[PDB]
Design a protein around this ligand. Sequence first.
Ligand SMILES: CC(=O)N[C@@H]1[C@@H](O[C@@H]2O[C@H](C(=O)O)[C@@H](O[C@@H]3O[C@H](CO)[C@@H](O)[C@H](O[C@@H]4O[C@H](C(=O)O)[C@@H](O[C@@H]5O[C@H](CO)[C@@H](O)[C@H](O[C@@H]6O[C@H](C(=O)O)[C@H](O)[C@H](O)[C@H]6O)[C@H]5NC(C)=O)[C@H](O)[C@H]4O)[C@H]3NC(C)=O)[C@H](O)[C@H]2O)[C@H](O)[C@@H](CO)O[C@H]1O
Length: 721
Amino acid sequence: VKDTYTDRLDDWNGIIAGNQYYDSKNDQMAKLNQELEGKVADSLSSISSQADRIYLWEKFSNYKTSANLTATYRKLEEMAKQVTNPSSRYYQDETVVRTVRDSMEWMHKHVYNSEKSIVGNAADYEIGTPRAINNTLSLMKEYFSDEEIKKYTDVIEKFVPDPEHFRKTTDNPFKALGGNLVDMGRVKVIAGLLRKDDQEISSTIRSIEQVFKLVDQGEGFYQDGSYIDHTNVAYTGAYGNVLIDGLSQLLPVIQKTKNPIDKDKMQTMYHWIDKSFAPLLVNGELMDMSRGRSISRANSEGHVAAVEVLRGIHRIADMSEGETKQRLQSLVKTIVQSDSYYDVFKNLKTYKDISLMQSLLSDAGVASVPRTSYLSAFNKMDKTAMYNAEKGFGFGLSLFSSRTLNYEHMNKENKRGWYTSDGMFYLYNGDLSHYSDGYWPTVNPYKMPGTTETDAKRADSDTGKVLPSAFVGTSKLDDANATATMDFTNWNQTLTAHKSWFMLKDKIAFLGSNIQNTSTDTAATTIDQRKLESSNPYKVYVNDKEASLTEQEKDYPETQSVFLESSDSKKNIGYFFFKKSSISMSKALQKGAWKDINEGQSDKEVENEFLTISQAHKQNGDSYGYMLIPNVDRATFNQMIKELESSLIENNETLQSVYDAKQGVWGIVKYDDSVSTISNQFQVLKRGVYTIRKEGDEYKIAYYNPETQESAPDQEVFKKL
Ligand SMILES: CC(=O)N[C@@H]1[C@@H](O[C@@H]2O[C@H](C(=O)O)[C@@H](O[C@@H]3O[C@H](CO)[C@@H](O)[C@H](O[C@@H]4O[C@H](C(=O)O)[C@@H](O[C@@H]5O[C@H](CO)[C@@H](O)[C@H](O[C@@H]6O[C@H](C(=O)O)[C@H](O)[C@H](O)[C@H]6O)[C@H]5NC(C)=O)[C@H](O)[C@H]4O)[C@H]3NC(C)=O)[C@H](O)[C@H]2O)[C@H](O)[C@@H](CO)O[C@H]1O
């Protein structure tokens, strides 16, 4: 029965499958179509036939694991996509139509109905499964009656009745904010159109609209671009991704309902793109520090994840006009063209997404210009992202605080994230593949780069923790220069450190003071654990003389510098030690499996070579002190460590400071309210974090107090001397 609800569903079909756009002459469309053909063949040759059965598919048979419900209905959706494609071999196929129908019925009667209770994880009963049912029904709505469609969605109503609340039938329910609110959207608007229910669509839209509100606490977007999910976790790059991905599919539909969404409540979406997501995207890669436990999935490494966000943006762009459309088209086009490592099309899963990207890349009117330098201090999620366009590298700093969880190990994913927010750093360089090709299952999780740690063994059954201290944050001065610190205590209160970082345009200084250990376990700071390419060997230098690294750890006492020299300048990494420091280094094959870190993953052995730089801390009160100088040739590094000979102002228990004389910039971290005179030019007065620039005879000042999460009047923290 055909009216405006089914007009809306025609539009949804065009978005989630886009059969209407399919063109067999299109190389990239034809390839995805081929992938759906083979997936439907596998389901059809596999499925349980004859006299009534205990499952539809054996690989997905234990209906107590709820991931098996969604995986089963997603196989039916795939059949509904091929069955409504004129160019599929399954086009209006009688077996396929009958199979989808009988399978919906069998599921309804035996596995997933209103008499059922949630067993296992609720996301499946409330989001994953309802989306696959709704999509199946929508694609194939000319093969079902109105009564069948109502019958097969009654269950969806029992599990998701309220527009406002996500878990309501359980012995334990919560509030829909964030991507779950947008996920509520996709479930209920579509179930609403399928069931010809105006109250369901309108109230569902009224409810989605709250996602446009910036928040002060809990889940959602903050004014500084942070995005929080699961109560206290940094999560732009997974739950954020869902939010933008899901909303951007639903909007063309919402905008033609009788309850359209105001074009001013919209403008918040562009602030998300520019403030929250864009800083997180480097050479086509979405930074791991923002993806939570999704880092532990072989099929969602950084460049694959990035595409979720990008296809979100390109849809937003398509529904905009004039200037905002061109700019967002250009943002997407430049990100995609910088990426020599990953073929975007491999994560573009509908014909209209393929089509949109194709037109975008070949439209000469759409500019593809290299992105400019920036620096985003996501204080509200204790992360900092930095990017230098001159030299070509990004930097991520992964922290946590009293306000945030260090790592998320949930649904048996990310078993060894332990130290991923312990002042872990990321370097984004000419090696696009670095954090990919099985970085995550192969990296030694005891030696996460930048982190100071004991060598105690860790247990995979462990969960995340908040930090005892609130004194964790970034003071940003400008697009090139900031300072961070972290009042560090380890997971069992045996070790501390005052860790601070000095972001100074084309280099970052790492200071640690007040290093203390009450355990018997040895303590060390990992300077680096860099994954290598057989195709691009580093020549390694210590104090400017060639060294040769071995599987076996070698000691390099009296070290002023280490330099890692590629044939490509954009892969080079220098480490300048302000004071001669006692270090060790090795280069070794490291093995493991994705399953080691995500139970639901493959157990196949993966391997990669890694080069590890560590500094032992054997005494209480110990210190570290070095400058990371990326993307310069050896001769340039040698000159810069001469410019910087005296850059270290202080590195003690109450005060840390570095000075860039070339820029005239100071970073400073104070742990107490004493008067600190700095370079004989000014004094700084309060506990907190400082980035300062001398312009002739004035000072620009960036003070941040991380505990109260406030800046301050200039006269309370700064005085010229
Ligand atoms: C333990 C406990 O009690 N915890 C609670 C806590 O509950 C937890 O909540 C979270 C949460 O969601 O917040 C739960 O998180 C999810 O867990 C599962 C299981 O491990 C993960 O698999 C899931 O990760 C997502 O999984 C999806 C999936 O496969 O189901 C992924 O799906 C795909 O997403 C695409 C993005 O739009 C989508 O396009 C795609 O569909 C296809 O799209 C096409 C298209 O391009 O249009 C196409 O045409 C197609 O037709 C269409 O099918 C969709 N499906 C496929 C097959 O590709 C998704 O990308 C992936 O991210 C994970 N969710 C996230 C966001 O990570 C957790 O399990 C719960 O336990 C409570 O929340 C908390 C209170 O707040 O308290 C805790 O105690």
